[PDB]
Design a protein around this nucleic acid. Sequence first.
RNA 1: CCCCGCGGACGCUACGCCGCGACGAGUAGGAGGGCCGCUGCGGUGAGCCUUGAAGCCUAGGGCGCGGGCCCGGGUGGAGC
RNA 2: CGGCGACGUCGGCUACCCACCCGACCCGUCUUGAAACACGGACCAAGGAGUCUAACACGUGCGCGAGUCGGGGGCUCGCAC
RNA 3: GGGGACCGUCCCCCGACCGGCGACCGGCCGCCGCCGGGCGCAUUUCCACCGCGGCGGUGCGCCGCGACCGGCUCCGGGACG
RNA 4: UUCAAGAGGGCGUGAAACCGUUAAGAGGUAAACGGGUGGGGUCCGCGCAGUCCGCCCGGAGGAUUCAACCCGGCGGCGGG
Lengths: 187, 53, 56, 128, 125, 147, 52
Amino acid sequence: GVDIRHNKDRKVRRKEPKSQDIYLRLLVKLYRFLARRTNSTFNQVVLKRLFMSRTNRPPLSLSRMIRKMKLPGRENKTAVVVGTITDDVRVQEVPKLKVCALRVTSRARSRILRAGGKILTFDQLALDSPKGCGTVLLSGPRKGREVYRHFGKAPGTPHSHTKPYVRSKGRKFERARGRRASRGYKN
Amino acid sequence: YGTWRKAASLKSNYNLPMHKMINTDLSRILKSPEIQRALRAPRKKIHRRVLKK
Amino acid sequence: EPYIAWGYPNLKSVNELIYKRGYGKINKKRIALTDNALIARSLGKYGIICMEDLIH
Amino acid sequence: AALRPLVKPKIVKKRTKKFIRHQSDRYVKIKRNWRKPRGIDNRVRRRFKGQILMPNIGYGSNKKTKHMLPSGFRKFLVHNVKELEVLLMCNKSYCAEIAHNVSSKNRKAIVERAAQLAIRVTNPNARL
Amino acid sequence: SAHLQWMVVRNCSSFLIKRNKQTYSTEPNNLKARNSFRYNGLIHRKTVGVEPAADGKGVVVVIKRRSGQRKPATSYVRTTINKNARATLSSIRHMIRKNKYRPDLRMAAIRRASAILRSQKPVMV
Amino acid sequence: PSRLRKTRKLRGHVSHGHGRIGKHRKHPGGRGNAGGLHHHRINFDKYHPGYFGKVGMKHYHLKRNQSFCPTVNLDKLWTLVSEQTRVNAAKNKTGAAPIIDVVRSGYYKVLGKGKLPKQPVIVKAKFFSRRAEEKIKSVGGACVLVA
Amino acid sequence: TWRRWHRRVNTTQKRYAICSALAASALPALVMSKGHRIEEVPELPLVVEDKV
RNA sequence: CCCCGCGGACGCUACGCCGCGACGAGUAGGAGGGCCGCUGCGGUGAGCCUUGAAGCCUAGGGCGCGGGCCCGGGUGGAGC
RNA sequence: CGGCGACGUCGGCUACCCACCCGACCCGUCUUGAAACACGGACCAAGGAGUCUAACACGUGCGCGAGUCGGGGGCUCGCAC
RNA sequence: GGGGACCGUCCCCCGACCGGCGACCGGCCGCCGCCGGGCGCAUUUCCACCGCGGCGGUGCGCCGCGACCGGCUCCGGGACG
RNA sequence: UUCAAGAGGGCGUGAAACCGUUAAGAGGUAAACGGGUGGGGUCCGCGCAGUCCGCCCGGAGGAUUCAACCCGGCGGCGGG
Ligand SMILES: [K+]
Ligand SMILES: [K+]
Ligand SMILES: [K+]
Ligand SMILES: [K+]
Ligand SMILES: [K+]
Ligand SMILES: [K+]
Ligand SMILES: [K+]
Ligand SMILES: [K+]
Ligand SMILES: [K+]
Ligand SMILES: [Mg+2]
Ligand SMILES: [Mg+2]
Ligand SMILES: [Mg+2]
Ligand SMILES: [Mg+2]
Ligand SMILES: [Mg+2]
Ligand SMILES: [Mg+2]
Ligand SMILES: [Mg+2]
Ligand SMILES: [Mg+2]
Ligand SMILES: [Mg+2]
Ligand SMILES: [Mg+2]
Ligand SMILES: [Mg+2]
Ligand SMILES: [Mg+2]
Ligand SMILES: [Mg+2]
Ligand SMILES: [Mg+2]
Ligand SMILES: [Mg+2]
Ligand SMILES: [Mg+2]
Ligand SMILES: [Mg+2]
Ligand SMILES: [Mg+2]
Ligand SMILES: [Mg+2]
Ligand SMILES: [Mg+2]
């Protein structure tokens, strides 16, 4: 007998996409080969993002992509996102962008192309930059989800600002005892 | 059902779904000189366990 | 103290332990020291390149 | 005489006897089909010495000789002549056998065709 | 595309046979008759198949031409070889190797031709 | 699909996953939100503060239509007109500014979150916030009220 | 009787299933893999005159 | 600048195949896999079947760690 | 490298009966603790127990995406499907 | 209320340059390959039989024996410091 | 009579428990069970002088036609 613990032997991580999308599986095959047969760590990151779930591949708005592309030294670089690129109607000027995405919204696609931009899929990105040279790997806001407002410390604990689960919002719904000093306590 | 450059004229809001992979020719992509130039040499020798003499 | 037996090995004990039962932790794997190249690849930066260097 | 397989390794069986269900000897209502004992005090589940053994993955056969017949072939069930020609290029590793429901007239043609293609039949003389 | 069509029929096909821990494929131009991307006789732009002749002697070497991939009526060119076994194997070798027409199927087609010819010669007593 | 559920895997296991000691019993602890101030007090206090007690003034016969006042922010303001409208105004030589009627688009109040492009515009709304009015005048526009 | 026998599928889902079905019906390997004996058919996006 | 030889095994269902190292108790409980099993529906097997289906019986031959499964013989008589 | 092979023998660790050596208390259940002088169980067959609806929460898959969704209604020879 | 103008997407054409004939196809050439028919009618080629032939692979119907090599292990002699 | 009464008016199939008879084996520690052998028996193995097939050598026979050229057809690849 040996003195070890076996509760952490099996690392919990995606070794493949749980999706049955045959097109996603094809470009997983392409980037499984690229990650193995190159020393590019860019291919390793892209490959493991391809396995990720939809909640782990948040959409990237056009405004956020433009703002990251506008940073110094990123001219003539390809914006790579492993997910959906989304139109942001809050912006009025779209510059010229070279973009690779898993998926682009129709309105966002029209805006990028009309501004002289270029849109690539991940198969075309492999031919353009097999090692991912001259690319900016972007990601949508991972915690930009309603669930994360409810996560954290319990709402009925001091110094916790987490949203409780309520069927309705109003003066009659969970605004009394434990929420104000007049009604017992507040914390 | 429309084209990718025309919306459908009999569905008033439908357009053809877009490909997430334009060229689904894995063999041709992998054999392209752009891919092959970036690769490291294949490691095809099999190293089996050595009997510790 | 109650769980171990220990002492001061001599030169012959070190030689026979390393040669007969010497296994290296190479890439977290237990690999038998059958070739000097296994020692030199992982310990050459320290000047140790053979079984004799490891024993020394 | 008979068609020989490509290779005939020595088939090693870790256990040659069936795993009978606990107390299947004492009751007709309990069949020999294996069932894992889950009782709180069951001595077979607790693995007391001298008791009925429990199947586990350690008894698994060598992957090189798994599903191998004593003749060194592996069997593929066939229902007609058309399914027999899938074994044309697997002649020396896989043997055909005819399904039980195939008629006597039809399995005559299967046996005749398999003799031509050098496919071994496990039950060549099965309705005659 | 071959890779895309493979992802559709790798597990869902009328030619698929999955029995006795084995898998076989019964499409017309599958050498070795195995379910595999390399040997599938439907998804590739160029394929080669070896079949016994219509009568009881010779082999039929069918290749897939490159022009009418969506026109199955004229997509396959069938030639019949009815000579001695050594000459028959040489013709199949030259068709595959000299034309560089799927060289990865050279020995599979040659082995299949040998099996067909070996099955055509009369049995013994 | 019932073939994908735990019941198919719990056959042959006597307690069906509920445990031998505690068992699976009808209603231990009460039914529904029973004992929210008694034996379930910690859960209600921990996860639902404010649940117990009255706060505020009640109002009989509330009519949600009377309080109907949808709002739009300034960052989304130019999306209420066509793209032709905004390019024409920008390249217009004169001081002609387009009119955006947010009531027509379905909004009553104009809020002032975001920033406006540097071009004048006439905004028609029932209500304006103080900062929305200031930002509209900063780009040389005007705010006019409607009923 | 109130077992919820019916399911609603988004219209964009359903239109996208039709497009996939139509695109697959023009590829010989997929139609053959359904076992349709399209051996001697002149052309698989198979179109005849309006006279029919 | 292969050519007296025109030739040269296998492979790669990539959800595949191959290599190396360590490890393997388990109630309550959790999860995964099941080419384990039952019934019915959409497809598919140019599937099986009165030249004998289902079912049942069997000192018959085997396969799987196992759930189980295939085949021989008998009975049976219309489906699987 | 040797011996032996048809009406007597050769191989078949499986499967039938028997013998011997070693090991071996009757399961299920509650329980700190069951072989219990703790309960249920004579035997066999067939039946027999986490289901459906609604509402939430989180995870995963799919479509679209600052939008999304026709589920109620209506239009399509009114209906083999 | 119309009818116009403009703008955005389109449309089939009249035409040139641009990258390529592509996994959208034809005609000509060039090379190669296969097939059919002639010629070639024998130191070529092919077919079947025989040898208790050789070289390779697989494997011996059953029961046995030996040899050397390597791994692990338990022992025994001899000699040196 | 019937194809069949081993379908004979509560009659398709006809399981298990339980019982009768026949056959084989055994029997003073209740039976039953796990592991290991041994004996006997029913069967299985076309068991019974025990593989096949690639090249080459030798012997004894047949058949065209072997290569290369000519004509025709069809393919693969390349072409400013
Ligand atoms: K963790
Ligand atoms: K276990
Ligand atoms: K549970
Ligand atoms: K079926
Ligand atoms: K099994
Ligand atoms: K039967
Ligand atoms: K009792
Ligand atoms: K509706
Ligand atoms: K009857
Ligand atoms: Mg251990
Ligand atoms: Mg553990
Ligand atoms: Mg077994
Ligand atoms: Mg029993
Ligand atoms: Mg216990
Ligand atoms: Mg359990
Ligand atoms: Mg039970
Ligand atoms: Mg219980
Ligand atoms: Mg365990
Ligand atoms: Mg109890
Ligand atoms: Mg007690
Ligand atoms: Mg007990
Ligand atoms: Mg007692
Ligand atoms: Mg009690
Ligand atoms: Mg009872
Ligand atoms: Mg009682
Ligand atoms: Mg039952
Ligand atoms: Mg009868
Ligand atoms: Mg009866
Ligand atoms: Mg009896």
